Design a protein around this ligand. Structure first.
Ligand SMILES: *[C@@H]1O[C@H](CO)[C@@H](O[C@@H]2O[C@H](CO)[C@@H](O)[C@H](O)[C@H]2NC(C)=O)[C@H](O)[C@H]1NC(C)=O
Ligand SMILES: *[C@@H]1O[C@H](CO)[C@@H](O)[C@H](O)[C@H]1NC(C)=O
Ligand SMILES: *[C@@H]1O[C@H](CO)[C@@H](O)[C@H](O)[C@H]1NC(C)=O
Length: 378
């Protein structure tokens, strides 16, 4: 019958396995265990016992990170009424008892990152209306049911990256400020009204929906299945959007005409054969990544290119490129294309290395190096 004491409370060398019977925490007199901040060092609790919070009833911040927890006793959080921040990440927890969060009304932060959760009990967060930050990344979740966040009307940060999710409707959480659903199996993305940073990279998304949102500033959608970009018109505040590794076949200026401050646009590794940002260039654009596509003719985009600081054209089939004497490029990639030699000679009157970041090493029979890049004379 071990008795673990603090030494505002750090437990040392607590070792509870599944077999272990009841153990003791703090002083027998509950009133002496008035510590508000609880953490463990060099400890393992394969099952989280009720004895901990039965004895410490004034805990506000409970850190159970990396305690090798596999199971939570059903009534572990019976006397947890004062807890505001609960950290239970980096364990091996397989399920949450249905009413585990029934008596934590003041909960604002909950971390369950890196565990073994495969589903959420109905009503798990129905009694935690103050919840503002939640992480359940690195679990095995397949579905977030639509009633999950009905009560969490102040939820601001939601991290669900690296699960197996085929459904989670973020439109049902209008309070969202930061949301991360990267590395899942989503096919549809509804973007809530006020989210400022949203990462839905590494999914299977082919449709983007939602109301005009003037707050969205960072949108990560790389590694999905997008075939259009019209929906971009709904996000006039974007500063960065990553559309790389999708199925886009053309980029036109139309979807970007409402962009007030877009600076970084990544579109590498798509299937682009057409590019028109000259009808109406994006005035604020600084970085444009068009590498690894199937572009052939892009010279008409000069007015857009002239204003950039970084332009990546490598790995296409581009034949010509024109820049004004006063262009602002600081980083340019050009290798692995299909250059006309005359175009390269003209180009290098206004730009050179190391601004030009790359080069071709060898050329095919009909080609030769012109300023370090393969080209054919015509
Ligand atoms: C969404 O969550 C993922 C995973 O937590 C974040 O991935 C990190 O991204 C940075 C670069 O921005 C990498 O250097 C880190 O290694 C990544 N962390 C991990 C654990 O993989 C990602 O940043 C999040 N998205 C946003 C926009 O915040
Ligand atoms: C989406 O893209 C991935 C990777 O290219 C591909 O394997 C998958 O077939 C695509 N998904 C659908 C449903 O088109
Ligand atoms: C230029 O951009 C490329 C992106 O392909 C990057 O790898 C490189 O570090 C940049 N070079 C400089 C000098 O910043």
């Amino acid at each position: 019958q071990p008795e673990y004491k603090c030494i505002d409370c750090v437990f040392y060398d607590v070792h509870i396995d599944m077999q272990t019977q009841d153990v003791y925490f703090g002083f027998e007199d509950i009133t002496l265990n008035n510590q508000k901040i609880v953490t463990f060092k060099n400890s393992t609790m394969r099952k989280l016992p009720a004895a901990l919070l039965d004895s410490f009833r004034q805990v506000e911040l409970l850190n159970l990170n990396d305690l090798q927890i596999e199971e939570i006793d059903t009534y572990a959080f019976a006397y947890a009424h004062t807890i505001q921040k609960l950290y239970m990440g980096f364990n091996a927890i397989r399920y949450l008892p249905p009413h585990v969060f029934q008596n934590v009304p003041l909960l604002t932060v909950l971390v369950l990152e890196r565990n073994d959760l495969s589903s959420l009990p109905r009503g798990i967060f129905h009694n935690t209306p103050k919840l503002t930050t939640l992480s359940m990344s690195n679990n095995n979740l397949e579905r977030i049911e639509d009633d999950t966040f009905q009560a969490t009307t102040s939820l601001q940060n939601l991290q669900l990256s690296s699960n197996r999710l085929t459904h989670v409707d973020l439109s049902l959480i209008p309070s969202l400020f930061h949301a991360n659903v990267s590395y899942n199996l989503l096919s549809t993305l509804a973007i809530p009204i006020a989210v400022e940073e949203l990462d839905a990279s590494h999914n299977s998304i082919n449709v983007v929906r939602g109301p005009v949102n003037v707050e969205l500033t960072i949108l990560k959608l790389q590694h999905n299945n997008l075939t259009d970009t019209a929906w971009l018109l709904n996000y006039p505040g974007l500063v960065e959007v990553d559309l790389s590794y999708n199925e886009l076949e053309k980029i036109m200026y139309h979807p970007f005409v409402k962009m007030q401050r877009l600076e970084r646009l990544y579109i590498s590794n798509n299937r682009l054969v057409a590019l028109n940002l000259y009808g109406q260039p994006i005035p604020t654009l600084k970085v444009l990544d068009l590498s690894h596509n199937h572009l052939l003719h892009v010279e008409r985009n000069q007015p857009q290119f002239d204003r950039l600081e970084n332009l990546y054209l490598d790995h296409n089939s581009i034949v010509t490129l024109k820049l004004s004497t006063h262009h602002t490029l600081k980083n340019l990639t050009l290798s692995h294309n299909d250059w006309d030699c005359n175009s390269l000679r003209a180009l290098f009157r206004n730009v050179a290395r190391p601004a030009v970041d790359d080069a071709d090493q060898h050329c095919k029979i009909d080609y030769q190096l012109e300023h370090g890049l393969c080209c054919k004379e015509s």
